[PDB]
Ligand binder design. Structure first.
Ligand SMILES: O=CN1CCNCC1
Ligand SMILES: O=CN1CCNCC1
Ligand SMILES: O=CN1CCNCC1
Ligand SMILES: O=CN1CCNCC1
Ligand SMILES: O=CN1CCNCC1
Length: 164
């Protein structure tokens, strides 16, 4: 069945806990596989040691730029970018896991976890999972954001991987 993966997150070197994500490989297998492999680091690169670089309260927590750490970077396991697989899953509420992008067909490694229903992103961002456990950790991360997206603490994915 669908993979379960985890992100262990620090703020300013202090552990916040673990976010567990279900990846909906049954609906978006290519997008799920990219995220899964970036969590395990099995291709030689991935999310471990990278940051949540953009966090907006009452919106989203964004991460996955493991090359430039500022929202410009990241890459997929397939190449620098890959197409929007489908828009079948919707941004239904807090806990939705979705791909960040710079327009159509520009998925790399950047992603976000929603903290509200972000319905205006339906048909624009590929939803590929949701938070199974650790929404408390997501809301802690959210609390360290700002309207500009700048974080008030350094938010680091200290470890990540696959649970099943
Ligand atoms: O959350 C929606 N899902 C539908 C497809 N199976 C995975 C779970
Ligand atoms: O609460 C929803 N919002 C929309 C996005 N900007 C932050 C507030
Ligand atoms: O801050 C990261 N960004 C990458 C996704 N598109 C908007 C800017
Ligand atoms: O690419 C990710 N984004 C976060 C949600 N708003 C649009 C840009
Ligand atoms: O906003 C820039 N990005 C780099 C390519 N992956 C999507 C986000």
């Amino acid at each position: 069945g669908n993979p379960l993966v985890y992100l262990d997150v620090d703020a300013n070197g202090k552990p916040l806990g673990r976010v567990v994500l279900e990846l909906k490989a049954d609906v978006v297998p290519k997008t799920a596989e990219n995220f899964r492999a970036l969590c395990t680091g099995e291709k030689g690169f991935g999310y471990k040691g990278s940051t949540f670089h953009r966090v907006i309260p009452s919106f989203m927590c964004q991460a996955g730029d493991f090359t430039n750490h500022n929202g410009t970077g990241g890459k997929s396991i397939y190449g620098s970018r890959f197409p929007d697989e489908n828009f079948t899953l919707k941004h239904v509420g807090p806990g939705v896991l979705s791909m960040a992008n710079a327009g159509p067909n520009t998925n790399g490694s950047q992603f976000f976890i929603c903290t509200i229903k972000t319905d205006w992103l339906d048909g624009k961002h590929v939803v590929f999972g949701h938070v199974i456990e650790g929404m408390d950790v997501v809301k802690k991360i959210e609390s360290f954001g700002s309207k500009s997206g700048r974080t008030s603490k350094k938010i680091v994915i200290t470890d990540c991987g696959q649970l099943s």
